[PDB]
C-alpha cells in the first residue's frame, strides 16, 4: 500500500500510520475491504490518498 496526497505528494509518517492503524481512513475499495474506512466526507483540508 502506497499513500500520496493529491497536489502535494507523499505525506509524512503520522497521517499514514494513522491511516494504516486506526481504520478511519479514506481509500479505494481494496483498502476499505481489507482494513475498513470512513467515508463521512466531513470537513477536512486535505487527506493523503492511498491506493
Amino acid at each position: 500500500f502506497v499513500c500520496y496526497k493529491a497536489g502535494t505528494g507523499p505525506c509524512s509518517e503520522s497521517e499514514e500510520k494513522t491511516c494504516k492503524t486506526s481504520g478511519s481512513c479514506r481509500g479505494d475499495m481494496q483498502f476499505c475491504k481489507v482494513a475498513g474506512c470512513e467515508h463521512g466526507e466531513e470537513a477536512s483540508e486535505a487527506k493523503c490518498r492511498c491506493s
Partner: protein, 51 residues
C-alpha cells in the same frame, strides 16, 4: 412519485456498484436489496470516475 413504494435516503452503509463511469454525472439511483436508494451531489459538483 406515484405513491406505490417508498424511497430510502442515501445511507453511507450502502456499497456503490463499480463499472459505470460516474464522471460528469449529477444524480444516479441504485435499487438496493432492502428498498430503493439514490445518490446525488450538491450545486456545482459532480461525481468523479469512481463516484
Amino acid at each position: 412519485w406515484l405513491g406505490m413504494l417508498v424511497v430510502k435516503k442515501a445511507k453511507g452503509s450502502d456499497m456503490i456498484v463499480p463499472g459505470p463511469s460516474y464522471k460528469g454525472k449529477v444524480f444516479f439511483e441504485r435499487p438496493t436489496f432492502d428498498g430503493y436508494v439514490g445518490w446525488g451531489c450538491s450545486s456545482g459538483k459532480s461525481r468523479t470516475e469512481s463516484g
